[PDB]
Amino acid sequence: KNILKIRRRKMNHHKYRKLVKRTRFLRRKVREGRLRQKQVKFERDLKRIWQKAGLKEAPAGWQTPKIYLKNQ
C-alpha cells in the first residue's frame, strides 16, 4: 500500500550500495583529487589576501597548514 514507496527506495539504496562497492577505488581516487584541489584553492585564497594587502612574501612564520589533506 505505502510499502510500494518504501520498496522503491529500498531497491534504489541497495543498488547504490552495491555500486559503491564496485566503483570503490575509483571513488577513492576522485575524492583524494577533490581534496588536493580544495587545499590548493585555499592556499590561493590566502596568497591572494597577503598580496592584495601589498606584502610580497607571506607574513613571518606562516606555514599555511594542510587542513583537508589531514591524514584520515
Partner 1 sequence: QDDPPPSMLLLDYQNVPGIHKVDDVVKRLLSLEMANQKEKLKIKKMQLMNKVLENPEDTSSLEARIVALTVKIRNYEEHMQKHRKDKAHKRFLLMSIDQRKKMLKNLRETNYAVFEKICKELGIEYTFPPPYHRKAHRRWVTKKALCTQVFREVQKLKKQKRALRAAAVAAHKQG
Partner RNA sequence: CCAGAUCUUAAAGAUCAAAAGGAGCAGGUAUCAAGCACACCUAUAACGGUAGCUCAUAACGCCUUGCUCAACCACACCCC
Residues contributing to the site for RNA (CB under 7 A)? 45, 49, 52-53
Binding span for partner 1 by CB under 8 A among 9-17, 20-28, 29-37, 52-60: 52-60
Picked from Mg ion, RNA, partner 1, none, the partner binding residue 12 (CB below 5 to 8 A depending on kind) is Mg ion
Closest to 43 (Cα-Cα) out of 55, 54, 35 = 35
C-beta closer to partner 1: residue 26 or 67:
67
Element (DSSP H or E) covering residue 14: helix 3-22
Closest to 43 (Cα-Cα) out of 23, 15, 62, 16 = 62
Residue 19 within binding range of Mg ion, rule CB under 5 A: no
